Design a protein around this ligand. Structure first.
Ligand SMILES: Nc1ncnc2c1ncn2[C@@H]1O[C@H](COP(=O)(O)OP(=O)(O)OP(=O)(O)O)[C@@H](O)[C@H]1O
Ligand SMILES: [Mg+2]
Lengths: 221, 114, 29, 57, 100, 232, 117, 49, 114, 100
């Protein structure tokens, strides 16, 4: 009855109908695999019980991907219903772009021979993966995440070197927090990134890109 | 062919052959572009796109969302439609004419509408 | 030992179709 | 000879006018690069000072 | 959760059971502590329909590790809405069984 | 044991990805090399045409067109890749080369090696057959400069220093993407073929003498391009 | 009229129509108009070619050891390495004109004689 | 030639203007970042005591 | 970064990155060949081998293993040694120069010996 | 206190007694050797382990650095030196001369 143990524990987590007050309990069980064997008994039981999985792998962690979530294998069966409209719209292309990047990564060596679209996908993915990196104990409010994935998916990072994306995304968000806080207020109050605010955000991105100094000394415009 | 009709088996195997070539050529398409292929391959790819899109259907369960009634194509009509579609008799139509279309006459009418 | 090694190494015996053509536009030699 | 020098300056003039368009841009992008490097370094120094004052407090 | 990866690709909705599965020293506790910390901006709102209250059940963890998690939550101000149900490794198997 | 099998699976997956990428890149480079062959063809056609005209107005007594009285030595230009992963390619060339040697040995002419490609160079270095000169670094993407150097060296050896009384080129003809066959062609002395039924400046004889080396350079260039396409 | 086809051993460089073509063959300078008798001539080591066509400016080509074939319809120039005037680095030509190697010096002289030098 | 010289002078004037627009943006930024970092310092000091 | 520093953390994480990449390239190298790698991956493999050999050290209590006496590398010298290594400052020295050698001065001595 | 891991692959390859240099170790080490053999053979085991690693690494390298090629040659000669037929013991002095 170990499966019964963990199921009985995790099926308490639920969102109650409005007749029961409408409260909720969200579980985030943590399980430690050995040698990344997700097929072991307890991991298999919990993977079956849970509505989604975040597979954190050591190979990604060492490669500099932190928090090491292996996109592609990690799924959340709830899906877009658990995202605000802005995040859904911005990140719809993110999964496809990352899948294509992981398909093409073997070609980063001989990109001279790639198609223009294929090279564009490779470069977009190389910057999206940097965009999903994040320092420890530095959570981002939903609006700032929306702006970051908007940088990534809309291609405003395609001009920044891969080495600088992390800094760019930071120095931009901070800037938007300091001088153009209207975008964040709109996103958090309306839960959507409207065209009126999207145009302003793009204007701010282009205004800031002039002021940024990439690590190699180049200029991004 | 012992259980399904011989024509049914032939049509299904031809569809499987096409959609398997197309999958093999998808690597070429996604990496070196469609223009890298030969004229025969590109025909095959254009036919396989329409074959795989024609396997889609305006499912009955979609009546709650799209409003349009679901389609129940008789098996014979499906066999004839895919026999025509693998031979290239409908490859001149745009790909959009096949998406979520319930049968062969419905396909004409989404073609004349396009 | 080094000197012995070198003097020994002095005496150690180591065991160690088609054809390209010019087309001439006349009928015969 | 007058005709000669006319021909001269003339050509040199068209080429150096194109070169001066190129030089004006190049001067623009160099001055803009210097100014934006100054701005980025100033912002970085301000952030360092902010990290120092946070450490002090 | 405050993690761009989770919130963008594997979103968690209130009522979900999102397993965090990984080898040792891969970022599991880090992800969960970041999720707990990210709820401070919702807590300060004062609206029960936005506030998320957290319970951090530590099982078989050394006492100093639970203390480190507590300090991480406290420096980020997340302890005023978080409860730790600590069953350190020293406790009998019964506590490690009941803590969840 | 399971750890070893997991490691082997990871190795095989990485190698599958690398080889798949190499396959697609090789397809693109087949396209590139075949396009280069097509681009180089018209010059070859026109130079062959004017060579036929000059021959129709020439005595046909240039040394490149007449068989030495007693052939005692023959040159062999083996065209080979300078990087591996081409399967049997190099072997198919090299084997044919040795076949040619067995012919040359049977005809009493000792072959003298000229090698293009690193792999054939190593092949002969292990069988201790001395190569007089070897060129490397352009089998993947040859240029007419390399072909001209090869042709000039070969023609100078033919005119001669010990020299040679004959020279062959062994290279992999690309007939179709499915077929790639190593063939050996005698590139000198050229045989006059009378196929049956213009002015020249100052004379057709001097133009013929100046053009035969150029024609041999063009044919060596075409052979190298053919070898590059076959290698891809 | 004439159609001048400057084709190199690697690739075809130029194939536009032309009214007159001038070059220094080994027998001297030669100029070709339409309907010129078929001819084959070796260009000199430093030979340059000048093409006159309807409207466009005169086109000067540096040719390395080329051959000129006047035909009933096309005057084809077969070249080892051919460079238009627009592709010439004048300083490189000036430096190479004094090179010890005979062929390199001839090629530099051809580039200069095209450059208008 | 005169037009190109005038355009070069205008480009130098426009470079002086963006140097202004680099000072205006950078000083305002540095000030704002200093403000937020001072606020962060105050907040953490208040949290700690 | 909050405890050991921000230069220590960067150097250590870059070393880990290089070693992980050279553990994923090891199989390709063993079967396909080092030449078949990209230029960046080849240079990274050189750095990685040198870094592995430099992480080795002639420990004081293991003079019965190696004969030579022990050595202590101060932390600051280590973090600069590895910063230099990850940036290719020592890519020209032979691999053996880094083997069982305690620090930069000893590295130079062994490089001169070889 | 140690291990002399005999491997069938080495035995067939002609390396007899077939000691896998890498896995094998003697923790007494130089303390169990006369001073002469300690001096001549101080780094022999680690040198041979590095040679085996390089040989596995340089299996299909088209060209090798001068240092790498010299190391491979030295290691191959040492390996041939450490081969020994059965029932052919060598006195310690002969061993120090050989390893020298
Ligand atoms: N996003 C991140 N960026 C940088 N470092 C991180 C990140 N997440 C975690 N780390 C670091 O990784 C190491 C392990 O993190 P963490 O404490 O989350 O481990 P864990 O995977 O929960 O493992 P366990 O509890 O079994 O030790 C710690 O050094 C932590 O600082
Ligand atoms: Mg943990």
């Amino acid at each position: 009855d170990v499966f019964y143990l963990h199921s009985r524990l995790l099926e308490r987590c639920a969102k109650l109908s409005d007749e029961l007050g409408g409260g909720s309990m969200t579980g985030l069980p943590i399980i430690e695999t050995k040698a990344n064997d997700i097929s072991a008994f307890i991991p298999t039981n919990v993977i079956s019980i849970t509505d989604g999985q975040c597979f954190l792998e050591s190979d990604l962690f060492n490669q500099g991907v932190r928090p090491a979530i292996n996109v592609g294998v990690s799924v959340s069966r709830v899906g877009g219903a658990a995202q605000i409209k802005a995040m859904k719209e911005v990140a719809g292309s993110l999964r496809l772009d990352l899948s294509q990047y992981r398909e093409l990564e073997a070609f980063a060596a001989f990109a001279s021979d790639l198609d223009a679209a294929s090279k564009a996908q490779l470069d977009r993915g190389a910057r999206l993966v940097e965009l999903l990196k994040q320092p420890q104990y530095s959570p981002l409010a939903v609006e700032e995440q929306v702006v970051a994935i908007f940088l990534g998916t809309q291609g405003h990072l395609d001009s920044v070197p891969v080495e600088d994306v992390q800094r760019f995304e930071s120095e931009l968000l901070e800037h938007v927090k300091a001088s153009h806080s209207d975008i964040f207020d709109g996103i958090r109050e309306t839960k959507k990134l409207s065209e009126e605010a999207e145009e302003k955000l793009v204007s701010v991105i282009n205004e800031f890109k002039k002021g940024f100094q990439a690590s190699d000394g180049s200029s991004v415009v | 062919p012992a259980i399904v009709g011989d024509e049914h088996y032939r049509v299904a195997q031809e569809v499987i052959r096409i959609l398997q070539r197309y999958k093999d050529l998808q690597d070429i398409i996604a990496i070196l572009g469609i223009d890298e292929l030969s004229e025969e391959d590109k025909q095959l790819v254009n036919r396989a796109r329409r074959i795989e899109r024609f396997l889609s259907q305006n499912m009955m369960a979609a009546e709650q969302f799209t409003g349009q009634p679901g389609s129940t194509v008789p098996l014979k009509e499906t066999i004839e439609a895919f026999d025509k579609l693998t031979k290239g008799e409908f490859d001149h139509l745009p790909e959009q004419a096949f998406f979520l279309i319930g049968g062969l006459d419905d396909l004409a009418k989404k073609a004349e509408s396009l | 030992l080094v000197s012995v090694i070198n003097e020994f190494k002095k005496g150690f015996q180591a065991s160690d179709l088609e054809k390209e053509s010019v087309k001439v536009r006349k009928p015969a030699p | 000879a007058e005709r000669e020098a006319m021909l001269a300056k003339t050509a040199a003039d068209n080429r150096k006018s194109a070169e001066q368009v190129a030089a004006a841009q190049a001067d623009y992008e160099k001055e803009m690069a210097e100014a934006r490097a100054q701005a980025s370094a100033l912002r970085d120094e301000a952030r360092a000072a902010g990290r120092s004052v946070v450490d002090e407090k | 959760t405050g993690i761009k990866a989770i919130d963008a690709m594997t979103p968690i909705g209130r009522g979900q059971r999102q397993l965090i599965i990984g080898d040792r020293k891969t970022g599991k506790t880090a992800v969960c502590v970041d999720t707990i910390l990210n709820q401070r901006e919702a807590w300060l709102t004062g609206d029960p329909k936005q506030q998320v209250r957290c319970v951090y059940v530590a099982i078989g963890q050394k006492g100093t590790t639970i203390a480190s998690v507590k300090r991480a939550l406290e420096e980020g101000g997340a302890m005023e809405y978080t409860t730790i149900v600590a069953a350190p490794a020293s406790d009998a198997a019964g506590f490690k069984w009941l803590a969840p | 044991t399971l750890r070893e099998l997991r490691g082997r699976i990871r190795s095989a997956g990485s190698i599958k990805k690398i080889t798949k990428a190499q396959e697609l890149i090789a397809t693109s480079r087949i396209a590139k090399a075949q396009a280069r062959v097509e681009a180089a063809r018209p010059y070859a056609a026109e130079i062959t045409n004017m060579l036929t005209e000059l021959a129709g107005a020439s005595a046909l007594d240039h040394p490149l067109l007449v068989e030495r009285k007693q052939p005692k030595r023959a040159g062999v230009l083996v065209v080979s890749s300078d990087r591996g992963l081409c399967g049997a390619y190099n072997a198919n060339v090299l084997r044919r080369a040795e076949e040619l040697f067995s012919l040359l040995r049977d005809e009493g002419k000792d072959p003298v090696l000229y090698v293009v490609g690193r792999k054939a160079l190593g092949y002969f270095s292990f069988r201790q057959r001395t190569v007089v000169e070897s060129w490397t670094g352009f089998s993947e993407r040859p240029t007419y400069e390399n072909a001209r150097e090869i042709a000039d060296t070969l023609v100078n050896a033919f005119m001669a220093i010990l020299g040679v009384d004959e020279l062959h080129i062994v290279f992999t003809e690309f007939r179709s993407m499915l077929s790639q066959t190593a063939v050996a062609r005698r590139a000198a002395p050229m045989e006059v073929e009378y196929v049956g039924e213009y002015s020249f400046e100052p004379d057709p004889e001097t133009l013929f003498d100046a053009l035969l080396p150029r024609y041999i350079a063009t044919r060596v260039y075409a052979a190298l391009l053919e070898a590059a396409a076959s290698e891809s | 009229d004439l159609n001048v086809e400057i084709v190199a051993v690697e690739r075809e460089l130029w194939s536009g129509p032309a009214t007159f073509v001038f070059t220094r063959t080994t027998a001297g300078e030669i100029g070709i108009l339409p309907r010129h008798i078929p001819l084959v001539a070796q260009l000199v080591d430093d030979a340059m070619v000048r093409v006159e066509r309807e409207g466009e400016d005169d086109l000067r080509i540096a040719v390395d050891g080329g051959f000129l074939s006047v035909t009933e319809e096309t005057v084809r120039i077969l070249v080892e390495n051919a460079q238009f005037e627009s592709e010439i680095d004048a300083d490189a030509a000036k430096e190479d004109a004094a090179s010890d190697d005979e062929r390199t010096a001839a090629w530099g002289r051809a580039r200069l004689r095209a450059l208008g030098q | 030639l005169a037009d190109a010289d005038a355009m070069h002078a205008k480009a130098l004037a426009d470079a002086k203007a963006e140097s202004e627009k680099v000072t205006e943006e950078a000083k305002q930024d540095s000030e704002r970042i200093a403000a937020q970092l001072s606020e962060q310092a105050g907040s953490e000091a208040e949290r700690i005591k």
